[PDB]
């Protein structure tokens, strides 16, 4: 059996683990033509997000039995082509709540702080700013969560406790009990958690009632001094939405790791705003996230090859 | 009685305070002469840090019998000048923890997170910087803290249990079970916590012990891989023996908010490096925190006046 990897992973130990077992090829930020040579004899093929996997790709590969993304997201992957042939497209979610929680309070405290503006001030000789702009204190305020999962419960539970904030968290399909479990309070009215808080954190699941849930009615409804940040997916925000809110002041500053569409264009129209800060969708890739991941992902290649059935089937059809 | 403030003070709440019993003038970023001619007849006087008060000010200040400073640094004032004419010089320290542990959070995290520097390359358009450099995961990395006192205990007690850190505390004067209470481990030897710690993060008072206690020697105990975080004062830094640290990567990087000399010039050698982020002694400088000092030094002053003792007297021979 042959295996191709379309990217590297997160972590070398799932190629290590694959080359044990299956012959290895690597290629990194491909062009079409190298894919299309390297993947018609492969029986198995990881893709490092976010580069695409076509129909055209897929047609080539006459022994193609597993396709494997690097993390949870499967929209670069054209999954309808793969079912076609009876492919299974699996998938490696769940593994990096720990890196995405320390990114969040990371982009929460840099916003509450004033990082990256106040860094440029000091790195400019402006050190007389200090009478003019003032950082925020995190105790006392209110942090709102939206979506209370694995992630959202976790950047609750430190911002209540270690942070001493309030925390609302909103999301229909959880108990209130959830809530209280990290000291946090569950909201049903969404209105109530945009009104309330200072600080806007996302951690939803991507469905069609999240998507684009953050708009300009939304922005509208969060006060003017209030931050938002987004660590989810870049669906739940509707971007020209939020150019638009932090033009015109309608919320106070953003923080956001996951963009819509990805990659982002170098000329994404958020980039002009200095109280927006950025990280290239790196919230759940630290190495011990990645090396999570990698086992992961070269674990459900061998199953298949196998006929071991993997856990994170993303067409259990076929 | 007539009341001068040289810079205003962090909140107007002091300022009002100072109103309902005084006759309060503010002067702000003055030049000398205005100093010279509003302090003449003026029974107090609030000096914002950190701005200075020479000799010839205190002695062209007849009335003069208090001076308070904005926070805990005294060494923008001629004290000596002050006692000779029997001067009180009042201080304001102490009022500012959570503000400078939530700013110590912020700026372990963003070194962590490679904050400010991924953040210039999404917005260059350098997305594909995902393949390059990772985020750290702070859970499971040693904090290495120097001094274990309000705020050193603050930030111990959030990195350990929180964040999931291991801690290591240096203090000489200080018992094992002040560490063992926030979580950590005291340790005896500078060199043991200099080469596990993967974050330094100094909290010492500034003493002749601690002054320039961070050298070339030490950057070369610590890890190349380590991080320092300086919120204490700039003193305890030998600045540039933390430039060459930097230079050649003795160490992997640097978050600073207090300087020396203050204010830092406008050519400071660190503000070159993209590994060393800045902030203008504003760790302590919140809403929260401001407010308690400005009415601590409403108070003080207008204690003196009244003859009561105030509680933080820099000179208590006078
Ligand atoms: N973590 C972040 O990246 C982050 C988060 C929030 C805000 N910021 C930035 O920080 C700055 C402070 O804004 P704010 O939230 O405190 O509200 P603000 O009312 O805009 O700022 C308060 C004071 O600072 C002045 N100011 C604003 N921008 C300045 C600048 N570039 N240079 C010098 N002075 C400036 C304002 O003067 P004028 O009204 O006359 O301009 C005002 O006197 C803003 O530029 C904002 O974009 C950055
Ligand atoms: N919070 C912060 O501000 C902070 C903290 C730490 C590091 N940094 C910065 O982050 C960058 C990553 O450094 P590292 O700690 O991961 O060790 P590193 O070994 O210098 O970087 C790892 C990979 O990233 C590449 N790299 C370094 N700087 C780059 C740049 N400006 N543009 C594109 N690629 C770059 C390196 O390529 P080459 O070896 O060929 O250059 C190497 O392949 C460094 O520039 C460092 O100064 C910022
Ligand atoms: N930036 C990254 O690198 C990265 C890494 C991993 C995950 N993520 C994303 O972060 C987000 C959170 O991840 P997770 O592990 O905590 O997922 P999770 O499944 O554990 O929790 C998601 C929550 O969303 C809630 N939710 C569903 N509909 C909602 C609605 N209309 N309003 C509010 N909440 C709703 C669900 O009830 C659930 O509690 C996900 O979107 C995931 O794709 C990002
Ligand atoms: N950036 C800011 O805005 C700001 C604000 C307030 C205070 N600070 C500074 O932060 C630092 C910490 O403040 P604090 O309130 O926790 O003071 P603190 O008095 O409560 O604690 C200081 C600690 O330093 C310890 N120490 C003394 N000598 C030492 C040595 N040789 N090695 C290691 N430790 C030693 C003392 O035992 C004490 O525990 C101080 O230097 C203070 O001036 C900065």
Request: glycine residues 10%; without cysteine; negative net charge.
């Given at each position: 059996h042959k295996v191709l990897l379309i990217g590297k992973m997160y972590d070398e130990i799932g190629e290590k683990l694959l080359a044990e077992y299956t012959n290895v090829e690597i290629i990194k930020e491909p062009k079409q033509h190298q894919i299309h040579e390297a993947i018609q004899d492969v029986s198995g093929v990881f893709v490092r997000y976010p580069t695409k996997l076509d129909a055209q790709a897929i047609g080539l590969a006459?022994?193609?039995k597993v396709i494997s993304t690097?993390?949870?997201?499967?929209?670069?992957?054209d999954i309808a082509a793969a079912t076609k042939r009876g492919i299974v497209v699996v998938n490696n979610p769940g593994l990096s709540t720990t890196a995405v929680t320390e990114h969040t309070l990371s982009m929460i405290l840099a916003l509450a702080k004033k990082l990256t503006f106040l860094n440029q001030c000091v790195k400019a000789?402006?050190?007389?700013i200090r009478n003019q702009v003032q950082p925020i204190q995190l105790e006392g305020k209110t942090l709102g969560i939206v979506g209370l999962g694995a992630i959202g419960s976790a950047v609750a539970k430190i911002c209540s406790t270690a942070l001493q904030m309030r925390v609302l968290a909103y999301d229909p399909?959880?108990?209130?009990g959830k809530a209280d479990t990290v000291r946090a309070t569950l909201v049903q009215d969404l209105d109530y958690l945009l009104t309330e808080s200072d600080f806007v954190s996302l951690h939803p699941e991507l469905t069609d009632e999240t998507c684009?849930?953050?708009?300009l009615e939304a922005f509208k409804k969060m006060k003017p001094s209030a931050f938002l940040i987004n660590t989810?997916?870049?669906?739940?925000?509707?971007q020209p939405d939020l150019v638009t809110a932090i033009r015109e002041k309608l919320i106070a500053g953003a923080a956001i790791?996951?963009?819509?569409?990805?990659?982002?264009?170098?000329?994404?129209?958020?980039?002009?705003?200095?109280?927006v800060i950025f990280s290239?969708?790196?919230?759940?890739?630290t190495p011990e996230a990645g090396m999570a991941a990698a086992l992961s992902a070269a674990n459900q290649i061998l199953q298949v090859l196998q006929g071991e059935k993997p856990p994170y089937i993303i067409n259990p059809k076929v």
């Open positions: 006459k022994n193609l690097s993390g949870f997201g499967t929209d670069a992957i000789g402006n050190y007389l399909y959880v108990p209130s684009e849930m953050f708009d989810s997916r870049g669906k739940v925000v509707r790791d996951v963009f819509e569409p990805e990659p982002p264009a170098i000329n994404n129209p958020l980039y002009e705003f200095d109280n290239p969708h790196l919230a759940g890739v």
